[PDB]
Design a protein around this ligand. Sequence first.
Ligand SMILES: COC(=O)[C@@H]1CC[C@H](C)N1C(C)=O
Length: 182
Amino acid sequence: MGPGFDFAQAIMKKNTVIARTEKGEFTMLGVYDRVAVIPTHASVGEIIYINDVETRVLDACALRDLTDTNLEITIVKLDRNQKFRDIRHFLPRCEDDYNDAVLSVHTSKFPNMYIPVGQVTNYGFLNLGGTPTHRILMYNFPTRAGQCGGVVTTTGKVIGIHVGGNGAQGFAAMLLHSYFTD
Ligand SMILES: COC(=O)[C@@H]1CC[C@H](C)N1C(C)=O
């Protein structure tokens, strides 16, 4: 409907796949080469389905900060025959607050879904399903089951992936440029 949705759509059309694990179907953001991200609660194994195709996982790393606190981001390298468009230049370098964000989801349950979530707070610490978690972003939208792995963007930045909610607020794990230096 406007330039926020324009940037979100451009990321969804080229940089997402549908990932299926034993824990469900997730929006999965491709970042560069064969490297993608997914919420750590997806429990990625040796094999994952990518757009309903059996795919070997070459590497998977559940990120934690230097205090050994969960960040809820798993970086996956996929044995896929095709690279993602490199979007690392759209990742923030530092923890920050944002205005006017969009959460975008693409699964069998929610195809081509875009939600204007508004203001995003650097929330920091969250007890996420009983797990102490750092670098959480918060937005005042009642997100539901099905949206995990959804991409959070502003105009010109990819800032996080949706990892949970409490019925009134939604929560995303930050994406930082320093996670994807090669
Ligand atoms: C992921 O967005 C893109 O590919 C570029 C980045 C700059 C501009 C917003 N844009 C659009 C809407 O085509």
